[PDB]
């Protein structure tokens, strides 16, 4: 932790406090209005810098619809490579039941509900997951494991 | 009084010359207004300031060009290093060839007599024994 002197300490004896002599420190006119205003008239050049040309889209307008969140699954996927790390830790503590001669993990008790295919699987694994991507099923099956799709 | 080496002896003499020619740094019109008569230096950030702009004939501003030689800076005019002393036990660790003893202004007469006696025995130059202590020791 480092501590620094407040700017007011430096500004004593400076008449203007960093606001200049010409364009001094005034009220909301010095901001071009109160709040997030002006973006279509005098701050339109700020919209053109950051937003879509022609439409100024993110600043103004509508695009698409929202699928209602109360009827949409909130996904918590895990990659195959990250899963391989997880089972290694789980095995050391003894949380893995090697039920069938192979390590058995089920994603839902681990807090995940989908399996993705990034990374590498280095052990044969039985994975109980509601959803698994195409490469996840292949990579798990290439290591001697298997994906089992449960029904929500 | 303090015996200095020849390099420092010249710098001490040079410092005395710089002291005599040093301007008394004042704000503009400090002589006119009683309300700022006893003020310290102020570097006023103003439109028409002629001290900051160093106009000939106006008072001079403060600059690092006026700094005195670094090797003798802060020394007592006698050449010694002043040390503030508040009790006799504070005399430990000082060297009478390098240090002079300045007694704290609020040290009372009873404690001042003990400091002065111990310091004079040890050979220290005491800068400010005080009028009362001088009379008492002289009477002794």
């Amino acid at each position: 932790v480092r501590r620094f002197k407040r700017a007011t300490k430096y500004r004593r004896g400076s008449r203007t406090h960093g606001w200049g002599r010409v364009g001094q420190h005034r009220k909301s006119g010095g901001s071009g209005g109160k709040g997030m205003v002006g973006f279509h008239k005098h701050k339109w050049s700020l919209v053109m810098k950051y937003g879509e040309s022609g439409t100024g889209w993110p600043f103004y307008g509508k695009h698409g619809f929202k699928q209602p969140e109360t009827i949409s699954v909130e996904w918590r996927p895990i990659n195959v490579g990250r899963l391989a790390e997880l089972v290694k830790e789980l095995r050391e503590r003894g949380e893995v039941r090697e039920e069938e001669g192979r390590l058995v993990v089920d994603l839902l008790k681990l807090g995940y509900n989908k399996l993705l295919g990034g990374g590498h699987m280095d052990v044969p694994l039985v994975v109980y997951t509601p959803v698994a991507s195409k490469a996840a099923v292949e990579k798990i099956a290439k290591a001697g494991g298997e994906v089992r799709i449960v029904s929500l | 009084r303090r015996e200095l080496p020849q390099p420092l002896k010249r710098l001490l003499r040079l410092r005395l010359q710089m002291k005599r020619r040093k301007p008394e740094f004042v704000r503009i019109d400090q002589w006119r207004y009683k309300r700022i008569e006893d003020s310290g230096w102020r570097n006023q950030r103003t439109l028409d300031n002629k001290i900051r702009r160093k106009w000939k004939g106006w008072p001079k501003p403060v600059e690092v060009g006026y700094r005195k030689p670094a090797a003798v800076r802060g020394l007592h005019p006698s050449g010694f290093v002043e040390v503030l002393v508040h009790r006799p036990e504070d005399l430990a660790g000082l060297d009478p060839k390098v240090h002079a003893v300045r007694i704290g202004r609020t040290v009372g007469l009873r404690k001042r007599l003990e400091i002065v006696k111990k310091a004079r025995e040890l050979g220290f130059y005491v800068l400010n024994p005080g009028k009362e202590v001088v009379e008492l020791l002289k009477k002794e």
Binding site: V1, R2, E85, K88, D122 | -
Partner: protein, 121 residues
């Protein structure tokens, strides 16, 4: 900005002084390069995961990390790695792969010239 001040941690400050002295004594530019990376502002200090050592290091390589070694990913190589600090999980992965974890002063004492040492950030 509040301009960079350097570390407040005296342990870090003494390590930086060590590396500069070691660079001068042994004419080793590596320990000067390490000290500059160690003295970086905190918000841009070097952190390396053990999984990165797989790509950038071969078996038997000696690696100096001018920062913290974090334990992320998996290590499959035998590496001798020195760093400013090592997290417990990073420590366990390096050792279990047969490697060794050193302090930077240990590496300098072992290899004053830093010959064959690879800088990894």
């Amino acid at each position: 900005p509040p301009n960079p001040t350097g570390p407040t941690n005296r342990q870090l400050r003494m390590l930086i002084r060590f590396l500069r002295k070691a660079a001068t004594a042994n004419s080793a530019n590596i320990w000067r390069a390490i000290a500059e990376l160690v003295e970086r502002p905190r918000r841009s200090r070097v952190v390396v995961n053990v999984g990165k050592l797989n790509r950038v290091a071969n078996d038997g390589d000696v690696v100096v990390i001018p920062g913290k070694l974090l334990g992320g990913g998996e290590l499959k190589k035998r590496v001798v790695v020195a760093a400013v600090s090592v997290t417990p999980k990073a420590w366990k992965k390096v050792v279990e792969a047969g490697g060794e974890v050193l302090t930077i002063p240990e590496l300098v004492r072992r290899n004053p010239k830093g010959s064959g040492v690879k800088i990894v950030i």
